[PDB]
């Protein structure tokens, strides 16, 4: 027996390396043999669990101009050294 | 047209008043007409969510003395109505 | 310099034993001396991190009637034994 | 009229496209006219959120060949527009 589940703000699916989030989903429920089955329908988004500190443009531009590094590498290097310019430079 | 989704540690279903948590569920996925549908099977547990707020002592007292309610119920009533005294009284 | 932060769906404050969730908050930001300060305003709710399995009324009522336990104790006992009636009974 | 909030392990600020995470922040709280205001200070990091969906190969190919975009950008463009090809093309 399928039943509608009202007022669901969000479903989150958690894995080791990431989470999947469905906002304001449509959700149905069923109970069978001791387990519940939930059908969740909506648009999903993927949350990679790594977070990165922000880096100022001037610092990125400086490192690029001084080392010949790409924007990608300069940015990464500065994240890798906690925003320390001298060490980002040294590392490139 | 279902695919298996491997390594799911937890699914949480979030509503205003509570969340439903399924540990180490089995999860299937399909996409149809722009929406994902996830089927999630496992044993479910519930976790309730309560209004987080400051309740004036004098309001708790007033509700208790006017309805004969315990401190516990008066406090929960006022939480339920967002500190509205008239409604807290009416519900008890 | 205070700046408004638009489109914030939710702020979650995490502690060891619980989380505080503010839905669709108003949020302002300021940067000073390397740290950002966020002012978050809205109605909060408290998520206690313990989740409980559901228990059928018939089982609660049975245990109550057979042991003389209160609804609170019968419910707790059945959660404590994973819904096993014979052991809930034995425990009361 | 601020109180200290002790033992906060993390604050997460959630938006559609990203989340801002502050580890071991300092947090103050006050209540005024029915709303809580939280002040949260600490070093912030960003975590981006991406549309989770199936993108047809032939659509990726079409966008690449029509705009000269890399597989990477075409795929991200189509993610950005929810699989709408016209708009994916226009944005690249």
* Residues D47, D6 within the same domain: yes
The total number of structural domains that make up chain C: 2
Tokens found for residue D37? 């205001």
What was the structure determination method?
X-ray
In chain B, the residue whose alpha carbon lies closest to the alpha carbon of C18 is B49
Q: What is the DSSP letter of D45?
A: E
Residues of chain C numbered 33-62 and touching chain D (CB < 8 Å):
34-44
Residue at token pair 């390397």: C34
CATH number of the domain residue A90 falls in: 1.10.8.10
d(CA D14, CA B2): 30
B68 touches chain C (CB under 8 A): no
* Residues B36, B73 within the same domain: no
* Residues A33, A67 within the same domain: no
- How far is B62 from chain D, CA to nearest CA, in Å? 19
* Residues D81, D47 within the same domain: no
Phi, psi of A52 (to 5 degrees): -120, 140
In chain D, the residue whose alpha carbon lies closest to the alpha carbon of A20 is D52
d(CA C29, CA D20): 12
* Residues C45, C63 within the same domain: no
* Residues A37, A76 within the same domain: no
From B34, B54, B82, residue closest to D82, measured CB to CB:
B34
* Residues C42, C75 within the same domain: no
Q: Check: CB of residue B39 under 8 Å from CB of residue B57.
A: no
CATH number of the domain residue C38 falls in: 2.20.70.30
* Residues C75, C88 within the same domain: yes
Q: What is the DSSP letter of C16?
A: S
The reply to whether residue A41 touches residue B44, judged by beta carbons under 8 angstroms, is no
Question: What's the gap between Cα A14 and its chain centre?
Answer: 12
Neighbours of D50 (CB within 10 A): 15
Q: Check: CB of residue C83 under 8 Å from CB of residue C60.
A: no
The reply to whether residue A44 touches residue D52, judged by beta carbons under 8 angstroms, is yes
- How far is D35 from chain B, CA to nearest CA, in Å? 8
| Residue of D23, D49, D55 best to disrupt the A interface, most CBs of A under 10 A | D49
Bridge-based pairing state of the strands D26-32 and D8-14: unpaired
Burial A48-87 (b: 16+ CB within 10 A, else e): eeebeeebeeebbebbbeebebeeebbbbbbeeeeeebee
A7 touches chain B (CB under 8 A): yes
The reply to whether residue B53 touches residue C44, judged by beta carbons under 8 angstroms, is yes
The angle at the Cα of D19, spanning C33 to B20, to the nearest 5 degrees, equals 135
* Residues A41, A1 within the same domain: yes
- CA atoms within 13 A of residue B46's CA, in its CB half-sphere: 11
Q: Is A29 left (phi over 0), alpha (psi -120 to 50) or beta?
A: beta
The reply to whether residue A14 touches residue B9, judged by beta carbons under 8 angstroms, is yes
* Residues B17, B41 within the same domain: yes
* Residues C14, C32 within the same domain: yes
Tokens found for residue C14? 């995490």
The reply to whether residue D82 touches residue B54, judged by beta carbons under 8 angstroms, is no
d(CA A86, CA A81): 9
Domain carrying residue A68? 54-92
The angle at the Cα of A24, spanning B24 to D90, to the nearest 5 degrees, equals 110
Q: Check: CB of residue B84 under 8 Å from CB of residue C75.
A: no
Strand intervals (E) in chain C: 3-5, 10-15, 18-23, 26-32, 35-42, 44-48, 52-53
* Residues A40, A83 within the same domain: no
């Amino acid at each position: 027996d399928m039943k509608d589940l009202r007022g669901v703000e969000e479903v989150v699916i958690k894995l080791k390396r990431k989470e999947i989030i469905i906002k304001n989903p449509k959700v149905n429920v069923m109970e069978f043999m001791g387990q519940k089955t939930y059908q969740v329908t909506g648009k999903a988004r993927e949350r990679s669990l790594e977070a990165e500190m922000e880096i100022p443009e001037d610092d990125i531009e400086l490192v690029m101009n001084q080392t010949g590094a790409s924007r990608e590498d300069a940015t990464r290097a500065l994240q890798e050294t906690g925003g320390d310019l001298a060490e980002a430079i040294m590392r490139l």
